[PDB]
């Protein structure tokens, strides 16, 4: 499965603010998420599937904000030119992350305005290298499935693709 993701990884969800996403699949969580059109504005989405994709090559990417996302090398992540790369493509070519710098500030500024509402006028916005990464071998991966733009933002405020 190319587009899972750890275990732990945070998933910022409306309702309940991060939880990881093994914890959601393996609940089953009934929860929105905040994704991202092409025009650039945030929306959120409710889970639609959720998948427990058993293990698979994990590897622990470092990034420059001191956050860190373990998935495989091919999982898509959102960069400063709204492409969805593999984020390994993304430590290779050392091309920079598009993610918002204050979670909490970003989420009461959507909740106050209608949505979908400009990802850039939502909170600042920060531009952060993968600096380095190494293999964790093969571990327990999971996937969620939504029903428009296949993306969300991560705890650390990183888009994630799916």
Request: glycine share 8%; charged share 25%.
């Amino acid at each position: 499965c190319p587009g899972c993701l750890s275990f732990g990884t945070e998933i910022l969800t409306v309702e309940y603010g991060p939880l990881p996403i093994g914890k959601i699949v393996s609940e089953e969580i009934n929860c929105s998420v905040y994704s991202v059109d092409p025009e650039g504005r945030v929306y959120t989405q409710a889970i639609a599937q959720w998948h427990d994709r058993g293990e698979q090559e994990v590897l622990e990417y470092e990034l420059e904000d001191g956050s860190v996302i373990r998935a495989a090398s091919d999982h898509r992540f959102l960069t400063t030119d709204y492409q969805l790369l593999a984020i390994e493509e993304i430590f290779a070519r050392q091309l920079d992350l598009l993610t918002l710098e204050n979670i909490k500030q970003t989420e009461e500024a959507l909740d106050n305005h209608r949505l979908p509402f400009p990802l850039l006028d939502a909170g600042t916005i920060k531009m952060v290298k993968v600096i380095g990464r190494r293999s964790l071998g093969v571990q327990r991966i999971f996937d969620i499935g939504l029903p428009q733009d296949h993306n969300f933002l991560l705890a650390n405020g990183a888009i994630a693709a799916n």
